[PDB]
Subunit: 66 residues, 4 copies
């Protein structure tokens, strides 16, 4: 639930800002975190935190380059 | 009320820094987080954490502008 | 426990780095979270997590100033 | 959890060529381990906090990655 929600919020906003490269980067990080979360080698909190942090800087980059 | 508490801390500090646009960004994220919690696709703790992460970046930007 | 531990680690580092303003900001955030947790308006996970978010940003600012 | 966070972060930071991020991460990991043995923090919270700091270390490692 939470990881998907963070990812969806970030992806919707990155698409609105028109940043294809940030969208692809975000998808890569999300997929990686979904695999690490699959194996139980990462808590849900850690996955959500890390995805939110890079999605935050990617969103900052989107607001500038626009 | 964790999400509300994080939101209040961030909004108070952004208002202190005189950054109205960051205040509007923060509220937009806060409204989105509530709709999501409302739909049950995210937990209160995760929503609060993610809002705090984005708010931390907003506080950095708001300070640079001051 | 966890909130105190995060706070103490960050405060020790901020003092080592000589950043009085970041130390005071961190203390303000910690006191706010202690009050909010007393009042039951924030989860323990959110308080510790958010203090870690802000403390990492404060440490970045401290190493940049130093 | 704490060991896993530390090992993942150390692998990535070593790949990126940041000896200084590796040293900072090791310091944090060791501190978290003293706090755990002294029982003033739980393993889950310690792992989460180490992951947060490691994410910042990784962002900076990638910042030297290019320019």
């Amino acid at each position: 639930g939470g990881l998907d929600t963070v990812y969806e919020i970030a992806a919707k906003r990155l698409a609105e800002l028109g940043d294809e490269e940030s969208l692809a980067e975000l998808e890569e990080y999300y997929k990686t975190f979904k695999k690490k979360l699959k194996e139980g080698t990462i808590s849900e909190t850690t996955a959500a935190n890390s995805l939110a942090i890079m999605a935050t800087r990617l969103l900052e980059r989107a607001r500038e380059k626009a």
